Write a protein that binds this ligand. Structure first.
Ligand SMILES: CCCCCCCCCCCCCCCCCC(=O)OC[C@H](COP(=O)([O-])OCC(O)COP(=O)([O-])OC[C@@H](COC(=O)CCCCCCCCCCCCCCCCC)OC(=O)CCCCCCCCCCCCCCCCC)OC(=O)CCCCCCCCCCCCCCCCC
Ligand code: BCL
Ligand code: BCL
Ligand code: BCL
Ligand code: BCL
Ligand SMILES: CC[C@H]1c2cc3[nH]c4c(c3C)C(=O)[C@H](C(=O)OC)c4c3nc(cc4[nH]c(cc(n2)[C@@H]1C)c(C(C)=O)c4C)[C@@H](C)[C@@H]3CCC(=O)OC/C=C(\C)CCC[C@H](C)CCC[C@H](C)CCCC(C)C
Ligand SMILES: CC[C@H]1c2cc3[nH]c4c(c3C)C(=O)[C@H](C(=O)OC)c4c3nc(cc4[nH]c(cc(n2)[C@@H]1C)c(C(C)=O)c4C)[C@@H](C)[C@@H]3CCC(=O)OC/C=C(\C)CCC[C@H](C)CCC[C@H](C)CCCC(C)C
Ligand SMILES: COC(C)(C)C/C=C/C(C)=C/C=C/C(C)=C/C=C/C(C)=C/C=C\C=C(C)\C=C\C=C(/C)CC/C=C(\C)CCC=C(C)C
Ligand SMILES: CCCCCCCCCCCC[N+](C)(C)[O-]
Ligand SMILES: CCCCCCCCCCCC[N+](C)(C)[O-]
Ligand SMILES: CCCCCCCCCCCC[N+](C)(C)[O-]
Ligand SMILES: [Cl-]
Ligand SMILES: [Fe+3]
Lengths: 300, 240, 281
């Protein structure tokens, strides 16, 4: 038997500059190299990427965010490399003190730097979001990626922006650090009385769901690649034996049915619902509900 | 309070969503049938959805689903019991007949095309610029059956051009004809290709294609289905 | 009833055990020998779960809980009311799960397809057995296993997690977390990409995989492919669960102090353990 987890032989032809449609071809790189390494798992072609006004704005803005943080990490290190590498996970750029509430008056050394790095992240992410809608629109494709992406943006916006403003201070926001953002998470749950009693946390867990769905789905398309089932779009337009036997495993095992297109509707919604529910759970935490244990005792 | 409102509102949205999701996975294979092909009494709890229509690229028509459903081919089976729920025995050669693990679907007898309207799969001899870039080149290698007997040799690789992957092995049989073997169903080894699913005598049985440079969606199913079916039906001739 | 294309697939054979004896369907469900086993172990388990709920005094499903033996019993058996039922249910639960996976292997053989799905499933059977069998046995007692109850299994997670400080610091937990988060990213993208080609701008003809691969490339400079994305999803989720069982097998067995302190190995490395400044010193 052969399992199809790694390719057996690799073929290569001329680099693929891609479909044109309404794209502005003046914004595509040279094809990068070819990774024979990657070629065993997937495609071996790096590039071309598309970079235009929004792409630079995003990329530039996102490096600015990244550096503002890392600068601070050198200030904390005393500009010593040995220290920098030692305490890397321990450094942290924290939001303004509670005193400064929602103003932008905080000293650079006390969360003025946080506010700068936040602003840059705010530009970079929202730029990148508009990038995903426009890359699809130029190819005539539906904007399912931009809308699904909007779900993760939702949680991030609640965590660092929407809930801080609803609470009345930037200090409620997530810091920029490896171990420090971990402790904010533990802390948050303690203050609101065990997030385990937040019913939106619990659903967001159930959807995180996606491990099961993508385990099953990936397992299946591999199990039916002997009939070229990985070719899902033309199996949608003209059902073949791959789609028929993949429906029947589902149906014979546990009783309900999945179409080739249908299971991707299952897939996009399983995933988007993680962060969609989770954002609601955080948004309500501290704004409406002070103690989730106490809340679960009355349901009101 | 306001959080309790949020959570009932959600569970309602979710119920509507499950219903939506559920009816979307009914666009194929429904309405349910009885074993004799007539429409089953109990069709399940949800109704069929309003038909959506795909527009196939390249002027290849459309597809409205759900649509009328026929197998568009003869099924050589017969009941083994007098009540629903039991297996259906092949009345002929199940691989020759195309039932069971050897089933094929009557797809369009057309090749899948790439986004530029060209055949998606071409023999590498006729796909310019393509070559084996890593791994063992199977061309030249002899092909071996599950009875440990030589059935032919690889004379070409059939390649997906837009996705740049191997899809088939053009195996030259002993009479001079070729067949395609799914790439997913062979083991390329250092001195041979090995096919566990077919014994050597069933290689000439593999369905053949019409145009030597192109393979249609039908021919693809008939070949992949045949090769897969041997896993069950060629078992009387196999060791390990 | 039958799916309109389904009759041609319901041929005899492929069974692992028992030949044509249990080779049949009940409605849409395939039975097999292992269908029967599953239903056996399930029926048994449910019976004992309902029994346990009698000795406990409550029929409310939000309070039924089956608890492992006290730590005092170590690894021996315990009285049904004071730990025996968890011991039996756990045997049945395992029965039902392993029969479920074997039953899927039979379904795979009839259909002529790969065994990727029961293989993937077994990684989840693995995690469960880590929590209820491998970790307890290695720790010397079944009391270290989680209880079968809806909210009481969540109290186990808090108390087990918090025995080691903030569990976040478990290095294997960290990796496991990552694969879980990335799997979801990966799923959201695949789901969106297929559907955005199948359902393009209104009135436009169906996109092709070519459009799919162009989109990813335009967006991030690299596209993993249509086979690759399925290889990647199977791989992300299996690793996620793999490092989960790994983060729990080491906890309480080889590492039993607070997880935050495990990280001192890095800070105390001799070439910098003593440079002043930073956070440490
Ligand atoms: C916060 C941010 C959250 C946004 C997340 C949305 C992700 C889902 C994206 C998706 O699958 O649809 C793409 C879909 C269509 O994209 P397109 O590319 O324009 O369409 C091309 C094809 O024609 C269209 O492609 P298609 O035809 O495959 O999609 C058609 C359409 C998708 O179009 C829709 O109508 C999407 C519905 C919007 C969902 C927003 C729900 C918000 C959460 C509510 C929570 C409530 C509790 C508080 O079908 C549905 O998915 C219907 C959903 C049914 C939901 C169940 C309703 C229950 C009602 C009972 C109460 O996007 C939307 O229309 C979403 C708009 C953005 C919402 C803000
Ligand atoms: C995985 C690491 C931890 C753990 C930590 C958590 C945390 C933390 C949470 C849950 C949550 C849940 N867990 Mg738990 N849980 C574990 C092990 C298990 C096992 C098991 C190994 O046998 C089971 C059956 C469950 C079951 C459940 C559900 C009560 C709930 C939703 C799960 C879900 O959506 O998954 C994804 C699966 C699907 C979407 C497929 C559908 C699955 C259905 C719903 C299973 C229902 C089980 C039924 C109630 C059990 C009895 C059935 C018997 C026939 C009697 N947990 C271990 C101990 N679990 C969440 C919750 O809301 O709890 C109140 C939650 O927040
Ligand atoms: C001790 C800690 C507490 C606790 C406190 C919290 C808190 C606090 C939160 C969670 C949240 C989550 N918790 Mg909890 N949680 C606990 C116990 C658990 C357990 C468990 C014990 O088994 C589990 C499985 C979970 C599981 C989860 C997830 C379901 C959920 C996060 C969804 C997600 O994908 O976020 C990750 C995804 C994002 C953050 C979105 C990111 C989107 C942006 C745009 C990405 C930008 C990237 C940026 C540009 C960088 C660029 C990088 C390079 C370009 C590559 N919790 C205990 C009780 N948990 C969250 C939630 O939703 O709660 C309801 C949350 O806020
Ligand atoms: C969801 C609830 C918590 C949270 C809880 C956790 C926990 C718990 C863990 C992480 C881990 C990580 N988190 Mg965090 N995390 C949160 C929000 C974020 C945000 C953000 C909103 O902008 C970012 C950029 C990160 C970034 C990171 C990485 C350092 C790492 C995850 C890998 C990954 O998912 O790759 C996705 C793909 C890419 C290409 C990048 N977190 C919120 C506040 N995060 C893990 C880690 O290793 O920490 C050291 C870990 O253990
Ligand atoms: C106070 C709580 C602690 C904590 C304490 C723990 C503890 C303690 C554990 C974890 C474990 C996990 N935690 Mg942690 N963790 C915390 C914070 C987090 C956060 C977060 C955002 O902060 C996240 C995302 C996670 C994430 C995770 C995962 C890495 C892992 C859970 C998945 C798993 O094991 O699946 C594995 C899945 C299974 C075991 C389920 C198998 C299902 C079986 C096979 C089939 C069941 C069928 C069912 C009965 C059928 C019924 C349905 C129908 C009736 C037919 N942790 C905080 C700091 N975490 C767990 C782990 O790794 O377990 C090994 C674990 O034990
Ligand atoms: C539905 C929920 C899941 C999800 C979905 C999702 N995320 C997405 C998308 C989607 C559908 C995109 O289309 C978009 C993307 O471009 O993906 C390739 C994105 C994306 N999710 C990202 C990260 C990310 N997503 C996360 C979460 C998740 N995203 C959820 C699990 C996390 C987690 C778990 O914490 C991370 C770290 C990026 C890969 C990308 C957003 C890119 C972006 O905003 O870039 C701006 C920053 C720069 C241009 C410069 C950064 C510079 C380097 C630091 C150097
Ligand atoms: C390994 C990656 C992920 C994965 C994959 C996966 N799951 C799978 C499969 C695969 C590949 C299947 O093919 C199989 C399936 O059929 O899916 C539809 C399955 C499946 N995963 C399931 C559940 C499940 N998977 C989970 C997780 C995961 N599944 C991983 C995250 C979880 C989580 C996250 O906790 C759950 C709850 C089922 C839907 C199904 C297996 C059904 C099954 O085994 O049925 C036989 C058993 C019964 C019908 C009931 C037996 C009852 C017991 C005897 C009594 C109950 C004992 C139990 C311990 C009580 C515990 C209750 C409390 C904890 C609340
Ligand atoms: C030597 O190396 C150099 C210095 C060269 C570069 C290295 C840099 C380093 C070491 C970088 C390290 C970065 C790290 C560790 C980053 C970690 C980030 C984490 C863990 C982030 C987690 C969560 C963040 C959240 C939730 C942020 C949300 C933010 C927003 C929603 C933005 C909202 C915007 C605000 C509040 C301000 C907007 C202002 C206006 C006026 C609109
Ligand atoms: C995973 C991200 C990869 C990005 C790929 C971008 C590579 C483009 C390289 C520029 C090519 C120009 N030149 C002259 C070197 O050929
Ligand atoms: C994130 C993707 C990383 C891909 C890692 C590359 C895996 C190489 C596997 C090689 C095995 C193939 N081989 C040589 C045995 O035939
Ligand atoms: C898109 C499919 C939805 C599948 C639903 C999964 C149900 C899990 C139930 C989680 C229980 C939530 N709650 C409030 C009781 O904690
Ligand atoms: Cl693994
Ligand atoms: Fe898919």
């Amino acid at each position: 038997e052969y399992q199809n987890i790694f390719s057996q032989v690799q073929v290569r032809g001329p680099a693929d500059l891609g479909m044109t449609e309404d794209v502005n071809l003046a914004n595509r790189s040279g094809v990068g190299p070819f990774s024979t390494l990657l070629g065993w798992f997937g495609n071996a072609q790096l590039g071309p990427i598309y970079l235009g006004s929004l792409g630079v704005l995003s990329l530039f803005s996102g490096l600015m965010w990244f550096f503002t943080i890392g600068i601070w990490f050198w200030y904390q290190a005393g500009w010593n490399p040995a220290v920098f590498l030692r305490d890397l996970f321990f450094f942290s750029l924290e939001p303004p003190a509670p005193e400064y509430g929602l103003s932008f008056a905080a000293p650079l050394k006390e969360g003025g730097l946080w506010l700068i790095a936040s602003f840059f992240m705010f530009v970079a992410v929202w730029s990148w979001w508009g990038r995903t809608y426009l890359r699809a629109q130029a190819l005539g494709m539906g904007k399912h990626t931009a809308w699904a992406f909007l779900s993760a943006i939702w949680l991030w916006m609640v965590l660092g922006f929407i809930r801080p403003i609803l609470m009345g201070s930037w200090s409620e926001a997530v810091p920029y650090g490896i171990f420090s953002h971990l402790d904010w998470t533990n802390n948050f749950s303690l203050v609101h009385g065990n997030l385990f009693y937040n019913p939106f946390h619990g659903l967001s867990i159930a959807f995180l769901g996606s491990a099961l769905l993508f385990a099953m789905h990936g397992a299946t398309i591999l199990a039916v690649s002997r009939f070229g089932g990985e070719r899902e779009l033309e199996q949608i337009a003209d059902r073949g034996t791959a789609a028929e036997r993949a429906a029947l495993f589902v149906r014979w095992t546990m009783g309900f049915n999945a179409t080739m297109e249908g299971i991707h509707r299952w897939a996009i919604w399983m995933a988007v619902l993680v962060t969609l529910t989770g954002g609601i759970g955080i948004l309500l935490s501290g704004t409406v509900v002070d103690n989730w244990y106490v809340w679960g005792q009355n349901h009101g | 309070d306001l959080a309790s409102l949020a959570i009932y509102s959600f569970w309602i949205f979710l119920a509507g969503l499950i219903y939506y999701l559920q009816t979307e996975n009914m666009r194929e294979g429904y309405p349910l049938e009885n074993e004799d092909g007539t429409p089953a009494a109990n069709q399940g709890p949800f109704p069929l959805p309003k038909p959506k229509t795909f527009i196939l690229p390249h002027g290849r028509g459309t597809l409205t689903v759900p649509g009328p459903e026929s197998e568009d081919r003869p099924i050589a089976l017969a009941r083994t019991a007098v009540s629903e729920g039991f297996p259906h025995a092949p009345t002929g050669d199940p691989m020759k007949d195309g039932v069971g693990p050897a089933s094929w679907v009557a797809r369009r007898d057309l090749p899948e095309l790439d986004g530029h309207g060209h055949n998606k799969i071409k023999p590498m001899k006729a796909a310019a610029g393509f070559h084996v870039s890593a791994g063992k080149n199977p061309i030249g290698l002899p092909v071996r059956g599950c009875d440990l007997e030589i059935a032919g040799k690889v004379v070409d690789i059939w390649v997906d051009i837009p996705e740049q992957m191997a899809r088939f092995l053009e195996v030259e049989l002993k009479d001079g004809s070729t067949r395609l073997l799914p790439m997913q169903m062979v083991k390329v080894q250092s001195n041979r290709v090995h096919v566990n699913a077919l014994s050597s005598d069933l290689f000439a049985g593999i369905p053949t294609i019409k145009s030597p440079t192109e393979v249609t969606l039908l021919e693809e199913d008939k070949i992949c289905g045949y090769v897969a079916g041997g896993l069950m039906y060629a078992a009387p001739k196999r060791k390990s | 009833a039958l799916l309109s294309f389904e009759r041609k697939y319901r041929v005899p054979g492929g069974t692992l055990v028992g030949g044509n004896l249990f080779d049949f369907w009940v409605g849409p469900f395939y039975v097999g020998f292992f269908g029967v086993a599953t239903f056996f172990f399930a029926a048994l388990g449910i019976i004992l779960i309902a029994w346990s709920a009698v000795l406990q005094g409550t029929w409310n499903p939000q309070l039924i809980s089956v608890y492992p033996p006290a730590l005092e019993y170590g690894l021996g058996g315990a009285p049904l009311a004071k730990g025996g039922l968890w011991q039996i249910i756990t045997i049945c639960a395992t029965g039902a799960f392993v029969s479920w996976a074997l039953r899927e292997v039979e379904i795979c053989r009839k259909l002529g397809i790969g065994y990727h799905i029961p293989f993937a499933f077994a990684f989840a059977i693995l995690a469960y057995l880590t929590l209820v069998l491998f970790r307890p046995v290695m720790m010397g007692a079944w009391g270290y296993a989680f209880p079968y109850g809806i909210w009481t299994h969540l109290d186990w997670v808090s108390n087990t997690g918090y025995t080691y400080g903030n569990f976040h610091y478990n290095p294997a937990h960290m990796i496991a977390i990552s694969f879980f988060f990335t799997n979801a990213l990966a799923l959201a993208l695949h789901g969106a990409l297929v559907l955005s080609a199948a359902n393009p701008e209104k009135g436009k003809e169906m996109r092709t995989p070519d459009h799919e691969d162009t989109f990813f490339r335009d967006l991030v400079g690299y596209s993993i492919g249509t086979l690759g994305i399925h290889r990647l999803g199977l791989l992300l989720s299996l690793s996620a669960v793999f490092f989960s069982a790994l983060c729990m097998i080491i906890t309480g067995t080889i590492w039993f102090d607070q997880w935050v302190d495990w990280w001192q190995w890095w800070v105390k490395l001799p070439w910098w353990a003593n440079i002043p400044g930073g956070i440490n010193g």
